Symmetry: D3
Subunit: 146 residues, 6 copies
Amino acid sequence: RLSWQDYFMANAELISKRSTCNRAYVGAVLVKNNRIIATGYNGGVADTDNCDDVGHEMEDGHCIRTVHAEMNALIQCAKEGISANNTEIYVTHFPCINCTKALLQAGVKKITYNTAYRIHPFAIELMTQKEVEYVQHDVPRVKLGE
Amino acid sequence: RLSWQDYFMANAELISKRSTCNRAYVGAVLVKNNRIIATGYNGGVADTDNCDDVGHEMEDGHCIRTVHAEMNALIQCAKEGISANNTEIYVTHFPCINCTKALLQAGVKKITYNTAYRIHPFAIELMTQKEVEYVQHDVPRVKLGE
Amino acid sequence: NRLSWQDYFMANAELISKRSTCNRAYVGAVLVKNNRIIATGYNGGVADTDNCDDVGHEMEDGHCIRTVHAEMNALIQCAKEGISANNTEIYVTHFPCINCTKALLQAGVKKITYNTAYRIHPFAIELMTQKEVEYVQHDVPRVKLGE
Amino acid sequence: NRLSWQDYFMANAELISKRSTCNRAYVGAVLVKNNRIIATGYNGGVADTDNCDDVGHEMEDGHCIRTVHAEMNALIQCAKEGISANNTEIYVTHFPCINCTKALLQAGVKKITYNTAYRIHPFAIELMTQKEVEYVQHDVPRVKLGE
Amino acid sequence: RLSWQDYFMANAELISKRSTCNRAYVGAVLVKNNRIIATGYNGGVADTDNCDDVGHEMEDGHCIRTVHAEMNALIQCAKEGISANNTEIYVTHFPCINCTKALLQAGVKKITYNTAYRIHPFAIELMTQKEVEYVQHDVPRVKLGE
Amino acid sequence: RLSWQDYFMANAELISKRSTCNRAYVGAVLVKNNRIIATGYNGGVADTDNCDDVGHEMEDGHCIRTVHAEMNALIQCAKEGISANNTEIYVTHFPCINCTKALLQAGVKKITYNTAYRIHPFAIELMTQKEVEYVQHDVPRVKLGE
Ligand SMILES: Nc1ccn([C@H]2C[C@H](O)[C@@H](COP(=O)(O)OP(=O)(O)OP(=O)(O)O)O2)c(=O)n1
Ligand SMILES: Nc1ccn([C@H]2C[C@H](O)[C@@H](COP(=O)(O)OP(=O)(O)OP(=O)(O)O)O2)c(=O)n1
Ligand SMILES: Nc1ccn([C@H]2C[C@H](O)[C@@H](COP(=O)(O)OP(=O)(O)OP(=O)(O)O)O2)c(=O)n1
Ligand SMILES: Nc1ccn([C@H]2C[C@H](O)[C@@H](COP(=O)(O)OP(=O)(O)OP(=O)(O)O)O2)c(=O)n1
Ligand SMILES: Nc1ccn([C@H]2C[C@H](O)[C@@H](COP(=O)(O)OP(=O)(O)OP(=O)(O)O)O2)c(=O)n1
Ligand SMILES: Nc1ccn([C@H]2C[C@H](O)[C@@H](COP(=O)(O)OP(=O)(O)OP(=O)(O)O)O2)c(=O)n1
Ligand SMILES: O=C1N[C@H](O)C=CN1[C@H]1C[C@H](O)[C@H](COP(=O)(O)O)O1
Ligand SMILES: O=C1N[C@H](O)C=CN1[C@H]1C[C@H](O)[C@H](COP(=O)(O)O)O1
Ligand SMILES: O=C1N[C@H](O)C=CN1[C@H]1C[C@H](O)[C@H](COP(=O)(O)O)O1
Ligand SMILES: O=C1N[C@H](O)C=CN1[C@H]1C[C@H](O)[C@H](COP(=O)(O)O)O1
Ligand SMILES: O=C1N[C@H](O)C=CN1[C@H]1C[C@H](O)[C@H](COP(=O)(O)O)O1
Ligand SMILES: O=C1N[C@H](O)C=CN1[C@H]1C[C@H](O)[C@H](COP(=O)(O)O)O1
Ligand SMILES: [Mg+2]
Ligand SMILES: [Mg+2]
Ligand SMILES: [Mg+2]
Ligand SMILES: [Mg+2]
Ligand SMILES: [Mg+2]
Ligand SMILES: [Mg+2]
Ligand SMILES: [Zn+2]
Ligand SMILES: [Zn+2]
Ligand SMILES: [Zn+2]
Ligand SMILES: [Zn+2]
Ligand SMILES: [Zn+2]
Ligand SMILES: [Zn+2]
Ligand SMILES: [Zn+2]
Ligand SMILES: [Zn+2]
Ligand SMILES: [Zn+2]
Ligand SMILES: [Zn+2]
Ligand SMILES: [Zn+2]
Ligand SMILES: [Zn+2]
């Protein structure tokens, strides 16, 4: 039976399947007391162009078109009025500095990630100072459907 | 990529992977405006015995030990104070009469399911009266992890 | 001689039961957090569907399956509105059935106070015991309203 | 002969008034949204402070100022818990004073149903009129609970 | 830079600038963990006449037309469904007995005020009994805009 | 008497007075139906170093140390569980691309700003496509305190 860690990392990878930016298919699942409260994948602002259709918007070696997966989970909370305080997050890719700041500021207490994607040393510095646990964990092998 | 329908049915199946009652491994995902707001699988009341460990509690041909997947999604909303009104649900198995009544009463507006499990005609009657569609949809074939 | 909290809320549960539309048992439930009422419910059909009063019971295995139960109507008020039922207690006219018991325990209801020892399911007792939730019998007080 | 919604909630307001601790008027209030109870209140001292029953009234200009009013206790339940009082109606045993009237109107309470025509302030009427909020008199129904 | 106390007292004074009762221009800011969660100024019920236009409604030496600043902050919470428990309030004027009772009942834990307006001894009595400090603090001199 | 626009822009400037990054003192006030629901200024993640004390963290010509003012307002909503949908925002400085994406995604419908700060053409493109109104408005001259 899938452990909680495997259960949520698998969910993060499934969530990434709708990513519309082929630089990285990113999925995030926000969890409170082992319950899923929000999810997100990387894509353009809702009702705007996606990279799949009009191409990336590159600036300083990053695609700036997308709302990031982690940010989409947090913004789901802000839009609906759901508390993200005292949560943990499972993400397919290590959070960029912008996502890191938002997550820490929102009260996210633990970050579990699969891919060591472009790890920013300042993101590590912030997680360390804020005493937020970060953990690498592989997505388990799971087959769904017939 | 995965359609919204495929995306959520896949999620429901993944959610079912932690089911602790082997009569049916059930998973449910509650969705509002294409966002996941709650999930649930079938298992004993939290902090109580599960069928996997102590056996089913059978009455009139049903296992009564478990909080049902759909009920776990709704009760997540009740416990946390998340609104379930104007949602839809994706579930691995057709809802029983008890789950159907609760879902309809909560303001769930559409039901999508995979397995046509023990369909109760009174459940159909109520869904029809409430103008809530019950749509069969197969779980897509999806492979997660390496 | 003011109504105690227990009497106050049990009286309320009985009053709440006065709109029940299934004559097998007129059930009323009041959900309480820190001695404040946050939700109520009585037993009746799904909203906007038929009630037993009008079309008869829908019997299955010796139970009327037509109704959303009183306790469930309280919990579903919370789920529908987005009101937290965690760390509450409930006052109910009738001892909760196994389905209501599971939902209450799962929602974080910490104590159950009931009047009528209605069809008490031994498995409901087993679960309340394991989950460490008290189930107290308390009579509805004699209260006259109006005039 | 089931209790109508109006009778159901007015009965509830009267029951709620049974814990009032200021004998100048036993006031009870029930806040309702889409025929669901979301909050209640009776008149009594600030929580954890003295009640009139025990220490006497605190009179100022012909009013007892000791109590948080029933209507205010309902609204404050909402403010303290974070429950939305917008687009509600209220049922109250006594017509709201000017302070309660202002707070109710400001909170988005859309209709006021009361039993007793208690010290009706003409300025309260003026405000309800301008704000377009109905104020309906309705008797508490004769209801016997218990035994 | 401005201390938290100066920051919020300044805000309360700015909030008071829209007051429509010239007996006292009152502003209130409701704060939870140094975040502003609601504000209010004294004026008529929304969509009703204001004192500026039709005059005061005087009774027993008080203008009864207005919803008070503090009450407007609390009622913002009630209307929207924002929790006022475990807050503090900053107000331009010492709260009257009605506002004091409501604030204490709502779970407001500290009161900071500038002007010692019409102090009611019963208000002091209740604050003291509830172990809620009432702190006088001057509005700082702050110039905004060019 | 201060118009609503002047009232909230003045508030945004006052909010900026606690900024701890001297590259730009930024303040934001999030408004729903002319009520203030959240505020923010630019500063380090809560309980971490500020630029005032340890210097800026410069990357590609931007200080990346700070959680931005707008982001702090939105994250207040996410942390507490307050809905930011159907709001408008008043900000001392035109939002950067990251803030722009988050605001649009959160359901912010109008942006009023004072300073035309480093206006990103892609932020304009997004506001335009998302049909979000943006308006320049000067902070009014307001003196507070004696
Ligand atoms: N469950 C969801 C739903 C949406 N989003 C985010 C990802 C994108 O940033 C944006 C997509 O929202 P749209 O309203 O544009 O949804 P579409 O149906 O158009 O999907 P897409 O744009 O991905 O085709 O919202 C998300 O992270 N998770
Ligand atoms: N994401 C979740 C978490 C919990 N539950 C439900 C399923 C069971 O009815 C019960 C399990 O909760 P526990 O607190 O017992 O969690 P455990 O870690 O013990 O899991 P399990 O009992 O499944 O081993 O809660 C759920 O549906 N979905
Ligand atoms: N205060 C309330 C309101 C409703 N309900 C539940 C009981 C029934 O299961 C259903 C009744 O909802 P309707 O929308 O059908 O309300 P009616 O006004 O039609 O009442 P009834 O059907 O009882 O005549 O909702 C409840 O328990 N408590
Ligand atoms: N269901 C409730 C609970 C409380 N209150 C209000 C009425 C009083 O203004 C105050 C009473 O709160 P306490 O915390 O003092 O409660 P007690 O248990 O001490 O009740 P009492 O003081 O009435 O004996 O709160 C209310 O209106 N409705
Ligand atoms: N940010 C706000 C908005 C409103 N109110 C309160 C003060 C008055 O009691 C009433 C004013 O609300 P209106 O809906 O009448 O707003 P107007 O735009 O008409 O403002 P005014 O009446 O002050 O001109 O609401 C408040 O305290 N703070
Ligand atoms: N009303 C508030 C309170 C906080 N913050 C944001 C700005 C900074 O990003 C961070 C500051 O939070 P701290 O918990 O560090 O508060 P301090 O009391 O330490 O203030 P500072 O760090 O500004 O000295 O939170 C904000 O925008 N608005
Ligand atoms: O969604 C996330 N989350 C993580 O925080 C990092 C990147 N992303 C997205 C952003 C972009 O679409 C991306 C590839 O990232 P860069 O373009 O920044 O290398 O994956
Ligand atoms: O979780 C759901 N959801 C559906 O509503 C139906 C059954 N179930 C569960 C209940 C039990 O654990 C089960 C097998 O169902 P029966 O024991 O009722 O046949 O799957
Ligand atoms: O509302 C509750 N709450 C309790 O959990 C038990 C039964 N009921 C209702 C269900 C039905 O309408 C009923 C009579 O119960 P039975 O038909 O299950 O005996 O009272
Ligand atoms: O609870 C309410 N609600 C109504 O708004 C009016 C009065 N009251 C209370 C206040 C006091 O305890 C009271 C008797 O009122 P007066 O002391 O103002 O006459 O009943
Ligand atoms: O807004 C507050 N808050 C304080 O609690 C006291 C008075 N006020 C208002 C009420 C009226 O508009 C006012 C002048 O008060 P009096 O009219 O009660 O003296 O300032
Ligand atoms: O708070 C905001 N909000 C706006 O979106 C833009 C910048 N800022 C902050 C970020 C940094 O502390 C800043 C000066 O911005 P740059 O360092 O990106 O030029 O003001
Ligand atoms: Mg799209
Ligand atoms: Mg368990
Ligand atoms: Mg009906
Ligand atoms: Mg007491
Ligand atoms: Mg007005
Ligand atoms: Mg700090
Ligand atoms: Zn891209
Ligand atoms: Zn990122
Ligand atoms: Zn089983
Ligand atoms: Zn079921
Ligand atoms: Zn029946
Ligand atoms: Zn039941
Ligand atoms: Zn009294
Ligand atoms: Zn009153
Ligand atoms: Zn006046
Ligand atoms: Zn006042
Ligand atoms: Zn800096
Ligand atoms: Zn920014």
